[PDB]
Design an enzyme around this catalytic site. Sequence first.
Site, mmCIF file in Angstrom:
data_model
loop_
_atom_site.group_PDB
_atom_site.id
_atom_site.type_symbol
_atom_site.label_atom_id
_atom_site.label_comp_id
_atom_site.label_asym_id
_atom_site.label_seq_id
_atom_site.Cartn_x
_atom_site.Cartn_y
_atom_site.Cartn_z
ATOM 1 N N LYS A 172 -19.333 -7.603 -28.901
ATOM 2 C CA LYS A 172 -20.231 -7.721 -30.063
ATOM 3 C C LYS A 172 -20.299 -6.478 -30.958
ATOM 4 O O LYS A 172 -20.226 -6.587 -32.230
ATOM 5 C CB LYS A 172 -21.611 -8.110 -29.576
ATOM 6 C CG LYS A 172 -22.178 -7.140 -28.586
ATOM 7 C CD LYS A 172 -23.557 -7.571 -28.161
ATOM 8 C CE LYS A 172 -24.156 -6.594 -27.191
ATOM 9 N NZ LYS A 172 -25.603 -6.853 -26.954
ATOM 10 N N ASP B 281 -16.716 -15.518 -32.586
ATOM 11 C CA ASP B 281 -17.459 -16.154 -31.504
ATOM 12 C C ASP B 281 -18.718 -15.384 -31.185
ATOM 13 O O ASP B 281 -18.804 -14.184 -31.467
ATOM 14 C CB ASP B 281 -16.579 -16.209 -30.253
ATOM 15 C CG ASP B 281 -17.175 -17.095 -29.142
ATOM 16 O OD1 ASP B 281 -17.811 -18.114 -29.461
ATOM 17 O OD2 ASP B 281 -16.938 -16.843 -27.933
ATOM 18 N N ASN B 282 -19.737 -16.068 -30.622
ATOM 19 C CA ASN B 282 -20.893 -15.435 -29.982
ATOM 20 C C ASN B 282 -21.782 -14.735 -30.999
ATOM 21 O O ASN B 282 -22.436 -13.764 -30.681
ATOM 22 C CB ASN B 282 -20.493 -14.429 -28.889
ATOM 23 C CG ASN B 282 -19.636 -15.034 -27.831
ATOM 24 O OD1 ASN B 282 -18.501 -14.600 -27.652
ATOM 25 N ND2 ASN B 282 -20.141 -16.075 -27.140
ATOM 26 N N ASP C 179 -13.550 -11.966 -30.769
ATOM 27 C CA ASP C 179 -14.158 -12.449 -29.540
ATOM 28 C C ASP C 179 -14.029 -11.398 -28.438
ATOM 29 O O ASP C 179 -13.746 -11.716 -27.268
ATOM 30 C CB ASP C 179 -13.468 -13.775 -29.125
ATOM 31 C CG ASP C 179 -14.189 -14.479 -28.032
ATOM 32 O OD1 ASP C 179 -15.432 -14.288 -27.889
ATOM 33 O OD2 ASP C 179 -13.528 -15.285 -27.325
ATOM 34 N N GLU D 84 -20.243 -21.568 -24.055
ATOM 35 C CA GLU D 84 -19.322 -22.177 -23.159
ATOM 36 C C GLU D 84 -20.009 -22.554 -21.835
ATOM 37 O O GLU D 84 -20.701 -21.742 -21.183
ATOM 38 C CB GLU D 84 -18.105 -21.261 -22.913
ATOM 39 C CG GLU D 84 -18.469 -19.796 -22.473
ATOM 40 C CD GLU D 84 -18.481 -18.781 -23.602
ATOM 41 O OE1 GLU D 84 -18.779 -19.127 -24.762
ATOM 42 O OE2 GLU D 84 -18.218 -17.577 -23.318
HETATM 43 N N1 LIG Z 1 -12.301 -2.919 -28.020
HETATM 44 C C1 LIG Z 1 -11.623 -3.917 -27.419
HETATM 45 N N2 LIG Z 1 -10.302 -4.160 -27.672
HETATM 46 C C2 LIG Z 1 -9.599 -5.138 -27.069
HETATM 47 N N3 LIG Z 1 -10.174 -5.930 -26.130
HETATM 48 C C3 LIG Z 1 -11.493 -5.756 -25.775
HETATM 49 C C4 LIG Z 1 -12.311 -4.733 -26.403
HETATM 50 N N4 LIG Z 1 -13.560 -4.783 -25.898
HETATM 51 C C5 LIG Z 1 -13.562 -5.799 -24.996
HETATM 52 N N5 LIG Z 1 -12.318 -6.364 -24.931
HETATM 53 C C6 LIG Z 1 -11.887 -7.504 -24.140
HETATM 54 O O1 LIG Z 1 -12.334 -8.679 -24.820
HETATM 55 C C7 LIG Z 1 -12.393 -9.759 -23.845
HETATM 56 C C8 LIG Z 1 -13.653 -10.573 -24.123
HETATM 57 S S1 LIG Z 1 -13.612 -12.231 -23.464
HETATM 58 C C9 LIG Z 1 -12.327 -12.948 -24.481
HETATM 59 C C10 LIG Z 1 -12.317 -14.475 -24.294
HETATM 60 C C11 LIG Z 1 -11.079 -15.147 -24.941
HETATM 61 N N6 LIG Z 1 -10.947 -14.888 -26.409
HETATM 62 C C12 LIG Z 1 -11.185 -16.637 -24.752
HETATM 63 O O2 LIG Z 1 -11.975 -17.316 -25.410
HETATM 64 O O3 LIG Z 1 -10.502 -17.190 -23.903
HETATM 65 C C13 LIG Z 1 -12.391 -9.110 -22.467
HETATM 66 O O4 LIG Z 1 -11.179 -9.490 -21.790
HETATM 67 C C14 LIG Z 1 -12.432 -7.599 -22.720
HETATM 68 O O5 LIG Z 1 -11.580 -6.830 -21.851
HETATM 69 C C1 LIG Z 2 -25.281 -15.008 -21.442
HETATM 70 C C2 LIG Z 2 -23.926 -14.418 -21.573
HETATM 71 N N1 LIG Z 2 -23.355 -13.565 -20.748
HETATM 72 C C3 LIG Z 2 -22.078 -13.197 -21.176
HETATM 73 C C4 LIG Z 2 -21.287 -12.243 -20.363
HETATM 74 C C5 LIG Z 2 -21.692 -13.841 -22.360
HETATM 75 C C6 LIG Z 2 -20.412 -13.721 -23.138
HETATM 76 C C7 LIG Z 2 -19.858 -14.842 -23.752
HETATM 77 C C8 LIG Z 2 -18.664 -14.714 -24.532
HETATM 78 O O1 LIG Z 2 -18.144 -15.828 -25.085
HETATM 79 C C9 LIG Z 2 -18.073 -13.472 -24.741
HETATM 80 N N2 LIG Z 2 -16.898 -13.420 -25.506
HETATM 81 C C10 LIG Z 2 -16.329 -12.248 -25.629
HETATM 82 N N3 LIG Z 2 -16.841 -11.085 -25.151
HETATM 83 C C11 LIG Z 2 -18.021 -11.050 -24.378
HETATM 84 O O2 LIG Z 2 -18.467 -9.957 -24.015
HETATM 85 C C12 LIG Z 2 -18.665 -12.347 -24.128
HETATM 86 C C13 LIG Z 2 -19.843 -12.488 -23.358
HETATM 87 S S1 LIG Z 2 -22.912 -14.840 -22.915
HETATM 88 CL CL LIG Z 3 -17.971 -25.972 -23.268
HETATM 89 MG MG LIG Z 4 -16.752 -15.337 -26.626
#
Ligand SMILES: Nc1ncnc2c1ncn2[C@@H]1O[C@H](CSCC[C@H](N)C(=O)O)[C@@H](O)[C@H]1O
Ligand SMILES: Cc1nc(C)c(-c2cc(O)c3nc[nH]c(=O)c3c2)s1
Ligand SMILES: [Cl-]
Ligand SMILES: [Mg+2]
Length: 213
Positions: A142, A167-168, A139, A197
Site C-alpha cells: 500500500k 488492488d486493495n 498490488d 479475495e
Molecule cells: N517494493 C516492492 N517491490 C516489489 N515487490 C514487492 C514490494 N513490496 C512488496 N512486494 C511484494 O508484493 C507482493 C504482494 S502480494 C501480490 C499478489 C499478486 N499480484 C496476485 O494477485 O496474485 C508480495 O509477494 C511482496 O513480496
Molecule cells: C485483511 C488483510 N490482510 C492482508 C495481509 C491483506 C492483503 C490483501 C492483498 O490483496 C494484498 N495485495 C498485495 N499486497 C498486500 O500486502 C496485500 C495484503 S488484506
Molecule cells: Cl474471491
Molecule cells: Mg492485493
Amino acid sequence: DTKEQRILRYVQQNAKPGDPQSVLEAIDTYCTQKEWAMNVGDAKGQIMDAVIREYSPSLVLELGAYCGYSAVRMARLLQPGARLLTMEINPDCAAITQQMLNFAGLQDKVTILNGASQDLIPQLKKKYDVDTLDMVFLDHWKDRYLPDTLLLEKCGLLRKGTVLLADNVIVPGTPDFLAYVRGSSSFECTHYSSYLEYMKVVDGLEKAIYQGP
Ligand SMILES: Nc1ncnc2c1ncn2[C@@H]1O[C@H](CSCC[C@H](N)C(=O)O)[C@@H](O)[C@H]1O
Ligand SMILES: Cc1nc(C)c(-c2cc(O)c3nc[nH]c(=O)c3c2)s1
Ligand SMILES: [Cl-]
Ligand SMILES: [Mg+2]
C-alpha cells in the site's frame, strides 16, 4: 514448507499443465478451503479480466507477483506477442511465481524482475528496453502505490491512455494514492467496488487512466 510452497504443490497436483484456467481454479479452491492467501482472487479477478479485455495491452507491468496468480490471470488474456513484466522483492516468491507460470505454459509471455519496484522502475528504459507501458497493475505494498506512480511518471514510462489498476484501495487501503489520483487532472479515475479475495469483506480496485503531464 511454507504456505506458498503448499499452494504451488496443490496446483501441480490438482490442475492441468498448460491450462491457465485450471491453475486459477486450483489456487482459488486451495485458498477457499485450506489457507487464505493474498492473491487478487476470483471476485476482483473478474473485474481485471474485463479491463484486460477492453484495453488489450501489449505491455503490462505488475508490481507484486507473490505466487503468480494475477500474472497467470492477466497473461492468459494477452494477445500473441504481448508481454508482462512482474516485479517481486522476495526471492522465494519470485521462485514460486516462475514455477507457477511454467506449469501454466505462460513463461514465454512473462518476465519476472527480481528486486524492489522503486529500484527496478528506473531501469526499465535502459536495461529492459521499455518505451512506455500500456497498463500497470499495482498490488505490492500500500505505501508504495503513490511514490511508485510518481516515479513511473518521472521516468517517462506513462503515455496518454496508460491504464493504472490498483488492488486493495479499500483493504488494506491506499488513502494517499486514492486522494492523489482522484484530485489530479492528470488522471481519469473509476472505482470498482468488490470483495477482498476469499472473504465477505468489501474491497475495491481503482482504475486511473493517465492523461499526460
Ligand atoms: N517494493 C516492492 N517491490 C516489489 N515487490 C514487492 C514490494 N513490496 C512488496 N512486494 C511484494 O508484493 C507482493 C504482494 S502480494 C501480490 C499478489 C499478486 N499480484 C496476485 O494477485 O496474485 C508480495 O509477494 C511482496 O513480496
Ligand atoms: C485483511 C488483510 N490482510 C492482508 C495481509 C491483506 C492483503 C490483501 C492483498 O490483496 C494484498 N495485495 C498485495 N499486497 C498486500 O500486502 C496485500 C495484503 S488484506
Ligand atoms: Cl474471491
Ligand atoms: Mg492485493
